[PDB]
Amino acid sequence: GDQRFGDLVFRQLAPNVWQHTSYLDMPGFGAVASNGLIVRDGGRVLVVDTAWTDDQTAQILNWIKQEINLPVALAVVTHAHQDKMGGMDALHAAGIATYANALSNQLAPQEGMVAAQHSLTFAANGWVEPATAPNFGPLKVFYPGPGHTSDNITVGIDGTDIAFGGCLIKDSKAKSLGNLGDADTEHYAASARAFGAAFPKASMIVMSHSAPDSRAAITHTARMADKLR
Numbered sequence: 727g728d729q730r731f732g733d734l735v736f737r738q739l740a741p742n743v744w745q746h747t748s749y750l751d752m753p754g755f756g757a758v759a760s761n762g763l764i765v766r767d768g769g770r771v772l773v774v775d776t777a778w779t780d781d782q783t784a785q786i787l788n789w790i791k792q793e794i795n796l797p798v799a800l801a802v803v804t805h806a807h808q809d810k811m812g813g814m815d816a817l818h819a820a821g822i823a824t825y826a827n828a829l830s831n832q833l834a835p836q837e838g839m840v841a842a843q844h845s846l847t848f849a850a851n852g853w854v855e856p857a858t859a860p861n862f863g864p865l866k867v868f869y870p871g872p873g874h875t876s877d878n879i880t881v882g883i884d885g886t887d888i889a890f891g892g893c894l895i896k897d898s899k900a901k902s903l904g905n906l907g908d909a910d911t912e913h914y915a916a917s918a919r920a921f922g923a924a925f926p927k928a929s930m931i932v933m934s935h936s937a938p939d940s941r942a943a944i945t946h947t948a949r950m951a952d953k954l955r
């Protein structure tokens with residue numbers, strides 16, 4: 727089940743895959759959970775998303791050292807907001823190579839984030855340009871179009887039934903999407919559907935602010951995003 731490690735929660739999702747969860751008390755919004763992923767690829771570990779803070783992200787690295795005890799070869803972060811990139815400095819202090827969408831790196835300063843060290847770029851069809859994502863192992867990175875933000879990216883894990891939608895995807899019982907100022911209202915619905923089509927066989931949809939869900943999370947997020955266009 728859930729594994730409490732200090733103020734963080736870790737949950738094994740598949741043999742080589744764990745979800746990390748961290749919390750931030752946001753005035754006016756309560757204590758908000760954010761989820762990312764940890765993947766073991768042979769003798770190395772790959773991280774998807776930081777925690778909200780540097781201190782929490784250092785604790786993720788501490789958990790990895792205790793439960794896996796292999797080097798963290800790289801981290802990929804899925805857009806320039808605090809839940810996904812708030813802990814970049816902790817990754818850099820630990821010597822970990824970091825990757826984000828070029829657009830996330832461009833937006834990072836004005837969003838109050840530290841940029842990743844390397845920039846991913848994407849083909850017109852959304853798949854990462856392979857030269858920009860060297861040694862990514864099973865991580866299959868896809869840009870579905872603007873939605874939750876202009877720069878949001880998504881990640882499939884080869885050899886598993888898991889795809890990670892980040893903050894683009896909400897769960898199948900979610901009530902709304904909100905009126906968030908960074909969202910692309912014109913394109914959000916198509917981007918959600920493009921994520922589902924990019925990972926057509928993934929049956930476990932992992933996301934930033936809900937527990938893992940079936941593919942109904944995609945249909946429901948899209949079906950909900952329709953009523954904004």
Ligand SMILES: C[C@H](CSSC[C@@H](C)C(=O)N1CCc2ccccc2[C@@H]1C(=O)O)C(=O)N1CCc2ccccc2[C@H]1C(=O)O
Pocket residue numbers: 752755758807808809874893904906934935
């Ligand atoms: C200063 C703080 C940073 S929070 S990360 C960027 C947010 C704008 C955002 O996109 N959120 C926030 C968290 C969240 C919680 C539940 C559903 C959806 C979200 C969404 C996301 O990551 O998908 C900040 O900007 N805010 C604080 C908290 C918060 C909570 C919920 C909605 C908006 C916000 C945001 C604010 O509008 O002040």
Ligand SMILES: [O-]
Pocket residue numbers: 807808809810893
């Ligand atoms: O976010």
Ligand SMILES: [Zn+2]
Pocket residue numbers: 805806807874875893
């Ligand atoms: Zn966001």
Ligand SMILES: [Zn+2]
Pocket residue numbers: 760809892893934935
């Ligand atoms: Zn989020």
